Write a protein that binds this DNA or RNA. Sequence first.
DNA 1: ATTTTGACGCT
DNA 2: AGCGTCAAA
Length: 430
Amino acid sequence: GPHMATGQDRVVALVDMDCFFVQVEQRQNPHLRNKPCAVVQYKSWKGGGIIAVSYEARAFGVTRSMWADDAKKLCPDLLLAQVRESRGKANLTKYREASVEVMEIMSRFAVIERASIDEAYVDLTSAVQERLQKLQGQPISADLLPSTYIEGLPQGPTVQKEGMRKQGLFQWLDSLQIDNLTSPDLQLTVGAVIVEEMRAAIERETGFQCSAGISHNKVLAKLACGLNKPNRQTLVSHGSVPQLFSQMPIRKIRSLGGKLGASVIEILGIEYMGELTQFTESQLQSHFGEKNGSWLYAMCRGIEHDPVKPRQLPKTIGCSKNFPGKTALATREQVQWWLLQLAQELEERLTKDRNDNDRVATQLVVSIRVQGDKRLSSLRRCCALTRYDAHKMSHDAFTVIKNCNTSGIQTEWSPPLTMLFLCATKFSAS
DNA sequence: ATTTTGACGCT
DNA sequence: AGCGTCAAA
Ligand SMILES: [Ca+2]
Ligand SMILES: [Mg+2]
């Protein structure tokens, strides 16, 4: 009752760019705008592998991981943009730089946590409080929320999408308690006003559209963000959680999309997130561990406490290349040449990072996959990263992995290498 | 023969 | 330190 917490203390948003790499290429090449389009890496094998897909192309069934030749089978007029290749490998610089454009705009509004190349969490709690004081008890107009969905509404006693959106928004605003600056629902609504402004700024200043979720924590904000895509935002209130979760597959919640989620389904014999409420905290801890158990117990009730970390920059800078099937690296010369290519791209990115961000990486992590392993990485070794020098970095990576060569022969490498990975880590201020 | 990334937990 | 899990384009 009165001491039972409800996880309504914060306002958190998750902003996610729509079909991000596609939008970067469409900004650059107007011929691709408003077209079924995809971004591919490496044309030679089956037309290249698709990594991003415009919504027009998704309507034909084109997806990520599809080979372009197969996507062309689904969408004969599919347009393609290729990832740049440098030093023999795909180079993602253009997308990292576009990401920086968007992150810097978001940072003007509030503290952000960079969650991936195209998404960031936003802690809006303080901005909401300040805006509520500026408003001076003044009601919130639907005009301030032109692209917002209220999850769960309309409800109770129009057949077009925008009509439904406006009906739900009207019901929500009609109900709000604006005279109470401490109402969680009002705080979320002001949060949504701010996110509308943030999203307008992103589009004005970059050309890129995005979707967003607004709720009381990161998991619900991420879930909300995905409910109305593209170019829309969704408010998930605490009160919307019981109905939302009653038919929500467990795997849709962040961190439960893999083995743990599968084990929750199998061990408990349930399918939907809401069904978790019927277990005690200790029961969940017994099956899934203390940390996971407590997390599940609170999360199925819509409560999560993970903070929006103040971190706009990535914590690691990495480069990797797969060598699939018959192209696996089988000679010492091959392994060293590709370590050099990787180290050169890495030196370039590290030098840029040092100039822009006043920091230096101090550890180099080397990872390889050997032919036969189902595991993504077969081996990981580290060494000191003392100079941004590609020849030195490539020499050190070879030195720390050379003893993996089973081969009795001088020049040959066995078992062949199907992956090389260099990652600069452990940044210190400079 | 999705590939190329990034963060974080366990022991 | 090294391995495993989960997730983004
Ligand atoms: Ca996205
Ligand atoms: Mg994303």
